[PDB]
Amino acid sequence: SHMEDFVRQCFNPMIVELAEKAMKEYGEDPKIETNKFAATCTHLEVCFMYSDGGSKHRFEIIEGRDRIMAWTVVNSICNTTGVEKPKFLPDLYDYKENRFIEIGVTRREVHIYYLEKANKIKSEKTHIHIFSFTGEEMATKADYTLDEESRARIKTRLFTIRQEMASRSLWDSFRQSE
């Protein structure tokens, strides 16, 4: 599929392999679920750019691990810090702020996805940070965790991915499929 080749020429190879394992872990095939394939890679890259901002030992990366191992770290973070165990696996834990973070990448309005992410968690303490494919962003308590320059990089990369999909005529199917 054309989407499949774009995702392979767009994201770095380890991001692609890490997405595949995340897909195969839930039965989804990147070769037919190609739109979900571009979404998992985009979400994976944002989480790794996000942890790249801040101090060296600031973030414990929960995403990209396998479910049992990912929970193993979450239970480890909880008993270490006393923070409540979330109902769903988050993406990162902020050692600087002592809270889990849920990263979200949207193709609709950032205000709708966060509203969609907020009622699902109900965990209150879990921080939520949302980015769009157009440059906006929305975070719990208006606390954006990272500095403006690190968030500007993520927004820049998202719009580049958005442009490259459109120049290849795959953006409309990607947008109209979320």
Ligand X SMILES: C[C@H](C[C@@H](C[C@H](C[C@@H](C[C@@H](CCN1CCCC1=O)N1CCCC1=O)N1CCCC1=O)N1CCCC1=O)N1CCCC1=O)N1CCCC1=O
Ligand Y SMILES: CC(C)(NC(=O)OCc1ccccc1)c1nc(=O)c(O)c(C(=O)NCCn2ccc3c(N)ncnc32)[nH]1
Q: Which of 115, 101, 111 is nearest to 134 (CA)?
A: 111
Closest to 178 (Cα-Cα) out of 120, 92, 116? 116
Q: Compute the distance between CA of residue 166 and CA of residue 69 in angstroms, rounded to an integer.
A: 37
Q: 79-104 burial by CB neighbour count: b if 16+ within 10 A, else e?
A: eeeebeebeeebbbbbbeeebbbbbb
Per CB under 6 A, does 61 bind ligand Y? no
- Looking at residues 72 to 91 of the shown chain, list those that interact with ligand Y (rule: CB under 6 A): 89, 91
Is the Cβ of residue 138 or residue 167 nearer to ligand Y in the bound state?
A: 138
Active-site residue, from 45, 63, 94, 137: 63
Interacting positions 136-165 with ligand X (CB under 6 A): none
> Of the candidates 46, 87, 90, 82, which has an alpha carbon nearest to the alpha carbon of residue 65?
90
Number of other CB atoms surrounding residue 47 within 10 Å: 21
Per CB under 6 A, contacts with ligand X among 25-64 are 48-49, 52, 61, 64
Q: Taking CB under 6 A as the rule, does residue 12 contact ligand X?
A: yes
Identify whether 122 is a catalytic site residue: no
Q: Looking only at residues 107 through 126 of this chain, which bind ligand Y when binding is defined by CB under 6 A?
A: none
Q: How many residues bind ligand X (CB under 6 A)?
A: 7
Specify the DSSP class assigned to residue 84: P
Is residue 91 part of the annotated active site? The answer reads: yes
Instruction: Let me know if 26 is exposed, middle or buried by CB neighbors in 10 A (0-12, 13-18, 19+).
Output: exposed
When the beta carbons of 76 and 167 are compared against Mn ion, the nearer one is 76
Which residues are at the interface with ligand Y (CB under 6 A)? Answer: 22-23, 26, 28, 39-40, 43, 63, 89, 91, 102-104
Annotated binding residues, written as ranges, equal 9, 43, 57, 63, 91, 102-103
Binding site for ligand X (CB under 6 A): 12, 48-49, 52, 61, 64-65
Catalytic residues: 63, 91, 117
